[PDB]
Amino acid sequence: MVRVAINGFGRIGRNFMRCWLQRKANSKLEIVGINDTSDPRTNAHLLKYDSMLGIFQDAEITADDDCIYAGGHAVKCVSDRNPENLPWSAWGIDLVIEATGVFTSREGASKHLSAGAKKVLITAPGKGNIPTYVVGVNHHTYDPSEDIVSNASCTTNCLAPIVKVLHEAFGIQQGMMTTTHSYTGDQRLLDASHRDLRRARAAAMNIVPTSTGAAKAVGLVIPELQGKLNGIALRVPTPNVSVVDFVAQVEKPTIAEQVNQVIKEASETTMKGIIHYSELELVSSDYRGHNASSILDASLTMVLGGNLVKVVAWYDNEWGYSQRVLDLAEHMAAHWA
Amino acid sequence: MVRVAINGFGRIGRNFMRCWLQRKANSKLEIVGINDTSDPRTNAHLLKYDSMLGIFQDAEITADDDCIYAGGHAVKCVSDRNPENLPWSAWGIDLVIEATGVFTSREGASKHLSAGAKKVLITAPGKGNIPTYVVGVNHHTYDPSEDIVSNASCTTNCLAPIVKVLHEAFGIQQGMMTTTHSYTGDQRLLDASHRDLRRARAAAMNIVPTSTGAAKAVGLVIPELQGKLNGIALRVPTPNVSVVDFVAQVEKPTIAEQVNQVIKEASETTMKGIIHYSELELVSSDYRGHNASSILDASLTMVLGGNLVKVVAWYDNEWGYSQRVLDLAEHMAAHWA
């Protein structure tokens, strides 16, 4: 049993905690420590009453000022912004889950390793050559001495299994993407001062575009496509779920039905539990809480000229990404060294 | 002076009326008739108090049950759903502006021609071989005996000048597009019964995808690219403005700066007043009421592998499209036959 911790009890942290509360019996992981910038009275309320996933129902949530009782299970909790003053060796922490969006560097994330933690899994595309791993693509090829691992962004975590399937079946020369992304917490609500100008504007009002390198992270997790994948993101006023457009330029020519057939059988042989395949005419809010990290929308797949394919993929960047974080954490627990 | 009329006093009709009230002096057009399914008391209020363009300020709006006084200028108004019972020859109508979204066929739109109107300009991609014309691409090449002309959709009206510039400068083999579209009036507000299932769902809540053929209408207005352009649309909860992504596969290789240079000089030589060029980091709501039919967003243009270009274009599908409708109407007034 592996004692794990959570740095930053935000959206990813609350979803990680809720996922572990829903996957408790099959777990080699026991969540024993969290730390947020809030007191332990508030974040227990925010855990129980999520305005996106409704009221939690299965287990009882309560807290006092030093611990949080989730379903009778106790969990410790502290508050500090310095990662160096944190009781890790005092709590016996193998794996800490970096989810603050602050400690993306190696030198930032390694502060927990210095302060007495054994491995760190950071839920962000980290700066510098941090080894990145996506469940369903290359979650096998990590060396267990790599204590500082990184899951990529949610967009990369959705996009990379589709790109893996299409690269194996057809071969990819180039590829664009344009993810229509739900608004995240970084954007200011009204027009307030912010480091980047396109995130400074109002979130509920605007399609704000942004440039991301998270398309290039597929070139990290798939090495032979690096420098060939690039794309932008569009933040639109939907709170939870998002869709990603993906334009690839394959070289083995095909039609629109065949790529759907390929991804449909890949959903049932290898990418089971990663890619779901849906031939329904659903819309965005029917994917709040879906377990797969990419639902391929079947009716919109199209091929022009044989060698130019477009797919779109629904994905929940708050629930499915947390599911892949927890699956990667359990998969590194199963190969603990 | 050409006596013109408006069928359907909806969003496009109110914006057309507001544009003509703002471009009155240079006009060979006099708006003399409208008809909506509402009484003349209500739609004058809806003209004066638009919840998108604010309160109209320049001229006074009032009405009684038979006429509407806009700034002292009188305009007639009636209400009928049958186009065959309409006083056109009784009012002396050269050009009627079809804007109901109902009469897209030739046989539907020709009912006004039968009922006593001389020309009809329909603001929709019509079914059947109706001659379509976009201002800035092929607004010259219409024969003035073509009395039933069609402006295309707003997405096509934005996209086609960019595709014209890139086809002339580089040559296009294939091309995709994915417009992130503002929600239109066709979608039901709550989940209500509707002919298409993806428009049946809630508009304020959801990214609803839809398949459109309005990308193929570029292949109508540019003949040598027909069957090479296709794309989908994403309706997101923004009320007014929208952005269109466009992925082309050019064959003359280039870089990202050069296509920006080409479109920047095309903004100043030929597409002046059609395409604006913006090197600012703006967001969506800074294009409410912009006069150009496509604002090219400069910072997001990218080229992979030399022969694969992506541009994005802001465009207002309620104001700029009305501007192009009124420009096409004046341009057919200037070549009246």
Place this chain on the structure above:
Amino acid sequence: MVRVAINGFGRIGRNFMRCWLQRKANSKLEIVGINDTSDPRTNAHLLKYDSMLGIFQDAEITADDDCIYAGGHAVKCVSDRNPENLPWSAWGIDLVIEATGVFTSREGASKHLSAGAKKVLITAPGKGNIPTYVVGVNHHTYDPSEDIVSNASCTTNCLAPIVKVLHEAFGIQQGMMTTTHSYTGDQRLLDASHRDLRRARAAAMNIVPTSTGAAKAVGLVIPELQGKLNGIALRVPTPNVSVVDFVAQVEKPTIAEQVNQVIKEASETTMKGIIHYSELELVSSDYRGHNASSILDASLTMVLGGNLVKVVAWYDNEWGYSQRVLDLAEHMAAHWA
């Protein structure tokens, strides 16, 4: 067992069907007929995938063009706007549930009685002296020969139990209310033509005010307060749940804690299952799907001058109102005559 039917498979109809699917075993009601203006293929999809209550999970939903199989249970379905051409006696219908928002008159609703139905329960404040009944206030005092009964609006259905408790405990001279109401389907999405001008404007953008007489319907269901209760409504851009403010002028003086005590014990003795009492600092979206028809918000109750009380009540106007409709339907099944 009572064979029942649903006129208009909209929000109230889909919620009624979902409630009966969740309360099947304790039911003397079997839903055997629905009719909407849509085909039976579409509304089964809209039943299964609600963008407000998520995907339905307990039973399987499928359909063909003549029947709908909900969890193996078959239900008939037809489409007609004329209520006079409907197979009621051909289907053996005791109670039809009017939920179109069209047939509010006695002469409109009695068309089903003429066409071969035995009782009609209309889910709207009907025009004319239709006997209105609220579960929890006067659901006992209906005569079973009254075949045309009316449940009131959702605002009245929330407000009247609180007014009953405060009138019994303190006595009410006068009373105002101002319900902050979620947007309903009647409002146009963009600024479109509509019979009332304040509902003609955009729903996602605006606090639109409206005048309602649904406060006066408390004076129907409580007879000694008629002509003493009046209030307005505010429609704000939230899709599901709403809150009602209520200012009463009591005459027996008291403090803010005592009215909370009165309503708390009334929640546990008489209004159990009608009024829930919450001393949490919750917000709106934590009441999506709550079973009570009024959650009294405890922290905001205030009394000025002893004789002037203000309460606020959360209530879900799409789920709890459907629950009260189904409870009234079962309660008229239990006293069938």
Place this chain on the structure above:
Amino acid sequence: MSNLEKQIEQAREEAHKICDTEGATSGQCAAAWDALEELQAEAAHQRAEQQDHKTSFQQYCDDNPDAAECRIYDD
């Protein structure tokens, strides 16, 4: 169908009569069976059009298209 419903059985009676009586192999009763097959063909054309009977949408949007149930702004 009632008219052609009767007329097919009438021509079937004639097919039993004229091609047992006035020559089983000649142009007359071959014209009779050709007629009965055309009656059958128009029964088939009636049958396929009644298979394509729309339920509601190609009626309510046939007569009144701009209602909110079938506005399509294919844009």
Place this chain on the structure above:
Amino acid sequence: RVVLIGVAGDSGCGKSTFLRRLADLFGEDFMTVICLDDYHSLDRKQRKEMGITALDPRANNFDLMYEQIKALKNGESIMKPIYNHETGTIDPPEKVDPNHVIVIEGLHPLYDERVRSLIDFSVYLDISDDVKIAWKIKRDMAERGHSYEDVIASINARRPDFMAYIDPQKQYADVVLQILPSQLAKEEKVGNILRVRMLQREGIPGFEPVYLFDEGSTITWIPCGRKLTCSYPGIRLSYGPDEYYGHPVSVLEVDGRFEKLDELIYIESHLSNTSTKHYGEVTELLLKHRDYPGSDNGSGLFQVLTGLKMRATYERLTS
């Protein structure tokens, strides 16, 4: 310009799915449909009085149809009469206009020789009598009219003049599609799986043949094997040069039932001169309508192949 397409068969005018596949290919904007039962001389009353079928070269005004057909080339809107089908009578005519593509289809689209000199591309569509019986059993079984098994005796009574009147037209058509009972499958009803073959004619330029791996050497190919897991019974193609009625033809022939996708793209990757601007375009045109009758067998393959050759002839005629 005016182009012209002749279709021949007794599948009912406008009552066959080949016109539906042409509609999916061209569009009813670019083409118009002309039935040819409209040019009947007189009615079923006069058919009973004259003792004559609807197949007689007396029974049609073959000259006025020629005058309208020649006036179609000159651009003017033609005025064609209409056979009132329920009564057998004749409507006063309708004024219809020419289009980009004009089709002609009926029992005698090709019996006249001046219009045989006029038609730009011709298709006969043959049916064997067995699947005639298997389609009439479905005709009187789905309708439940209870008129079966003497329609068997209507078949051979309809037969002899039909072979005199209609079947010598196929000696002048370009492409003729025969549909046979399947030699491959035996334990079914006699109309499930078809053995279809499109005898196409060499000579007249613009029309290429579509040859399987070689022009002019008979080759019977079964695509089952290392890359396709065939179901029962799978496909068995054919090909062969031949001389039908003393004319250089090239039969391309398919027996089997298409059960899935990869076995229908793998066949299409190996046909040649199929005149596509688009890879797999024939498979897309198969699967734009999964509900059409005969999509699962070679009939839907051959019909869209002929229509694709009609695209080729149209592009040859319009440059």
